[PDB]
Design a protein around this ligand. Structure first.
Ligand code: ATP
Ligand code: ATP
Ligand code: ATP
Lengths: 321, 173, 321, 321, 173
């Protein structure tokens, strides 16, 4: 009737490289969803989600894991920056709209048309929300005490109700946040998770840690994932009629490069690959049109060249005596 | 003043004189410079200017209240409210705080200090006198913590013109 | 016609462990509700609720007691953080939405259906509020004088009208807070209740204190309550086809542990059990799927193992000299 | 056609103990209402209310006197904290909703049901307001100059129009505050009434002082008033089938005690009686259920016992050197 | 100035001279340095710099007004407005306050001080003079509170070049 722990991890492995503990965590979570709802009724209601706190550096998968988790569970999803409130019920309100498109468009697949029947369409979306909704609160470490420190510490108190389970009204009816699964992420460079208000620190039982991505990790992210960056360009140039191929040493070089700047400057995780990939597919991307039939063979020499030279900073001088 | 603390045999004692001196005159002689905090499970003695001494004390108390009375964490939490961008305001006063487990000396510019091996702490103009007397006794007798405190306090009240002999001693079972 | 003091306390004992004074308090409160409404008419109006101020540490039952009180009295309920206002009439407005839904629940259940009758229902729902509504103001000790201390002290003055009895308009009509039963809770570590404004300190007659939870208390919370944590996992693993059992010494060990961290670090009350319980049911929770038919016997050794090691802090060094 | 000065004071004497000057004041006020409206027409309009400034300590009757004055005059009433504005026209807007309900109440008190006609029903309430409306501004001494002292000093300027007579629109039509009778109250511990802005200090002609309540006053408040605290409990316990009786010395003891704490700590006036009464009716209040038929004889010994011990403060030590 | 207070036989007296001195010159000699507060049920005398002395007095008064005239609580409440994060502003002035029940000495940096056993308090440049004379009379005669005050004040106005003999004495029935 529904995937299983190992089953789900396998699905996520098709889009995220590494980050196992993380994968596992959200897996057993989506699973407890099917476990409950199998229970009689007294317990059916009593048992609640074991919310998750993902703690990892910038762009290492925290979001894709959650976005994909929701995708493969075909569940209403929504991501919000925690600092966005420095109206909180909007989070649920929005999550519900997502459930209309997901239910509407999804029941349109059941069947110029018409059964439609809205007082039931709504009642059905509102269920999807109350039943398998998923909220992702990003950079929650940004609202930790560390001043207007109360402005942020306030945001925590404002999230409680949703997390602690309450009700909020949407243009489709009343929804309960009692069974919404929450996932908060944070880098926690300066603040520790134990710096959150207790009321909240306890509603986030599961703490899982994500690792920083390495050159070697990029190398795989670059080619393994379904619709990796290389798989995408190949596909795009294909349309202009150009056939492209990345040698292994190329891929290795592209990653060594992304990682390199990430270290030397502001580390922005995997995003850095989109950066370098675009700086490289640069020339071809343009000329590709009137270059039909040809085939570009991107090797290490190519990449080295197309990337030019990238900086190992001169904070030096200027500010130093 | 003179505030000294000796810890020996699972006993922790904090004692001090009672001379409030305004200029070179004496205003009060029966002052209680050592008091109990957090449901009497922690001792505090303070030297330095009266008011500051008191605010420094009342501050550590609020902290102790917010942290289940963890002496060490409370000290640090309080220190950190000086060691930041937005200063707290320099207080001319020091405290000697102690509970069953730890003995500590906290100052008004934020910085917690631990004792040296011997576990002896003293503050105030008459500090080092009590400190010298105490080290001597702890290293050369089997005297209880209480006795050494009582003893050193006097030896110091006898040398410091700002410390009298009316003591207030508190020990921790 | 309605439960009795001892009758209600017995009901609460089914969900909350300990906290007697507290249970008694809310019981005699919900009872005075049936006592009045039995009186003639002059006094019927004159007699008002004897509001409660619960004073106890974090997560020791203050909220469950109130939420359950309302549940067993089938009364409109609403919880709010006091600091949430550092529009107050929203509190009543929201309490009424809860009621409309709570009464409309009786109609579409006592009759492809139609009775509705707008004018009918609305009146009846509004009565449910005015008659047996319950408001729960959380962490009210947070708005005590202790700067922008007037911003909070202001919140007290803003709550008066409700507490002191007044009228506010809802999308269902006009409601009177004259007979709404209020229950404020607070930890009051720094502030004393006598730090509230008199006008308010006198509208909170009943002061009841709740205790901190002990290892022994956890032991009971762990197994006694209807749908305790252990009862829940047992039920959950049952679905994957796994039969689980906690030896007494296990339970004792789990609680000794929760309590242990609660003491050594930030004490978050009972919540700590969901924390430790999730860290223990960890491994099983995942493999339970392909582990059908087996039966895990969780004894002390298991728990001691599954919990690993939990920290006795190093505030040490770093900040000390 | 309407009560008279002595007539009205007698009615108030049935609910408030003491505070004569105060009673007299509001009496001649409600009377001047009947006096005008008897006048021809030129003067009928020219003569305006002689507003009242009540000056007395916390909970000594200031509000009850006004709330009862309005009650026995069957007049639209409204109480507001002056600091509530640190939209003022809402005050009138709210006063009108009150009258609209107080008047819907009559065209319905008379013999489906279409003895309505809104157009004329509105004009009916709207007159009730313009004619005998009563506004009670509480703790006005809180908005006196004494910093953001202009934020409050501003509130005075904002009230002028209403007091000085102007027009404000309500969802029922336009109403004039020209003949609304205003009663402001204040303790004035730090501020003097002459600290209000002149424009306003002259619109509050009548200054009347209320006294602090004494042990002896409590004794009476405890038993005399219609629906006193003792009359109330007697009534409530009656429902559980318990018959209760207070001996004179009991009542004397209860008061002596309320007064006692009021003196030793924060003096909150008569409210203190609800406090002590609830602490005494404590045990009974619960057990009363399964105590049917019995009869509790509350004498001095009972009171002395049930009240336990109440504190004569240790500001001592801790802060003193 | 010289402000002294003796409490003996259910009597509390507070008295002081009237010499307002600017530099080494004298501006006013009939100053009233002792006054009645909270419906004459509490005495207050003040030393230190004029203005501050007055602001420190007017401050204690508003407090007294807010606390049903509880001398002890008002003092502490006021002290607590200095012993916090947001300073109040150090005032160079002291007050000696007393009502039927207590005698207290309050300062401008916030710290209330109780008298020693003898119940004698004195402040001002000529404080110790009056204090010495007062302690002598209280320990060696049956003189009333009032007399001792009057007597010590003079003994002090005779030694201090800032204290004159024009007294203002107030007693508390
Ligand atoms: N481990 C990974 N495997 C595959 N793709 C990854 C991985 N980490 C990041 N990516 C890709 O890089 C981007 C990472 O952004 P994402 O928002 O998922 O990271 P994050 O850790 O949540 O950052 P934030 O600090 O914004 O939460 C996405 O486009 C994702 O597809
Ligand atoms: N005595 C108890 N018996 C049973 N369960 C309890 C008890 N105390 C707490 N719990 C459980 O632990 C949690 C305590 O949260 P709750 O909000 O009731 O506590 P609280 O003390 O009111 O906290 P707050 O500081 O938010 O007021 C609830 O999930 C409840 O189920
Ligand atoms: N003199 C009195 N006689 C009878 N009952 C009184 C008297 N004074 C107070 N009460 C009762 O005690 C309470 C006093 O509240 P009230 O609103 O009258 O106080 P107040 O003097 O207006 O205070 P504030 O305006 O500062 O809130 C009311 O419930 C009232 O019934």
């Amino acid at each position: 009737s529904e995937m299983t722990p190992r089953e789900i991890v396998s699905e996520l492995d098709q889009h995220i490289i590494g980050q196992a503990d993380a994968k596992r965590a959200v897996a057993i979570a989506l699973r407890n969803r099917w476990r409950r709802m199998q229970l009689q009724e007294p317990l059916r209601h009593e048992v609640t989600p074991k919310n998750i706190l993902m703690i990892g550096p910038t762009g290492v998968g925290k979001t894709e894991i959650a976005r994909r988790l929701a995708k493969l569970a075909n569940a209403p999803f929504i991501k919000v920056e925690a600092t966005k409130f420095t109206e909180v019920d909007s989070i649920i309100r929005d999550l519900t709209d997502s459930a209309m498109k997901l239910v509407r468009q999804q029941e349109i697949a059941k069947n110029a048309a018409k059964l439609i029947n809205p007082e039931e369409l709504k009642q059905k979306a509102i269920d999807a929300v109350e039943q398998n909704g998923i909220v992702f609160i990003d950079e929650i470490d940004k609202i930790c005490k560390k001043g207007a420190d109360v402005s942020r510490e306030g945001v925590q108190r404002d999230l409680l109700p949703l997390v602690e389970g309450s009700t909020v009204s949407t243009k489709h009816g009343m929804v309960k946040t009692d069974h919404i699964l929450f996932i908060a992420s944070g880098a926690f460079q300066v603040a520790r998770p134990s710096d959150l208000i207790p009321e909240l620190q306890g509603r986030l039982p599961i703490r899982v840690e994500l690792t920083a991505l390495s050159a070697a990790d990029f190398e795989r992210i670059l080619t393994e994932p379904h619709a990796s960056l290389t798989e995408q360009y190949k596909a795009l140039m294909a349309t202009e009629g150009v056939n492209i191929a990345f040698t292994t040493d190329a891929v290795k070089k592209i990653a060594e490069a992304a990682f390199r700047v990430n270290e030397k400057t502001e580390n922005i995780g995997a995003r850095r690959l989109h950066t370098v990939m675009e700086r490289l597919m640069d020339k071809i991307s343009f000329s590709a049109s009137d270059m039909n039939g040809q085939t570009v063979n991107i090797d290490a020499a190519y990449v080295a060249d197309a990337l030019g030279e990238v900086v190992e900073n001169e904070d030096l001088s200027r500010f130093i005596l | 003043t003179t505030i000294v603390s000796v810890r020996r045999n699972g006993q922790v004692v904090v004692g001090g004189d009672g001379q409030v001196s305004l200029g070179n005159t004496v205003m009060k002689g029966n002052a209680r410079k050592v008091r109990r905090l957090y449901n009497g499970k922690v001792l505090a003695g303070f030297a330095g200017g009266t008011a500051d001494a008191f605010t420094l004390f009342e501050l550590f108390e609020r902290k102790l209240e917010m942290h289940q009375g963890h002496l060490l964490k409370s000290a640090v939490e309080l220190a950190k409210d000086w060691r930041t961008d937005r200063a707290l305001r320099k207080l001319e006063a020091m405290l000697i705080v102690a509970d069953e487990k730890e003995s500590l000396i906290i100052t008004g510019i934020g910085d917690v200090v631990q004792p040296e091996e011997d576990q002896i702490l003293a503050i105030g103009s008459g500090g080092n006198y009590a400190l010298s007397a105490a080290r001597a006794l702890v290293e050369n007798t089997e005297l209880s913590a209480h006795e050494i405190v009582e003893k050193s306090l006097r030896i110091a009240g006898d040398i410091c013109v700002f410390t009298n002999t009316n003591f207030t001693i508190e020990e921790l079972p």
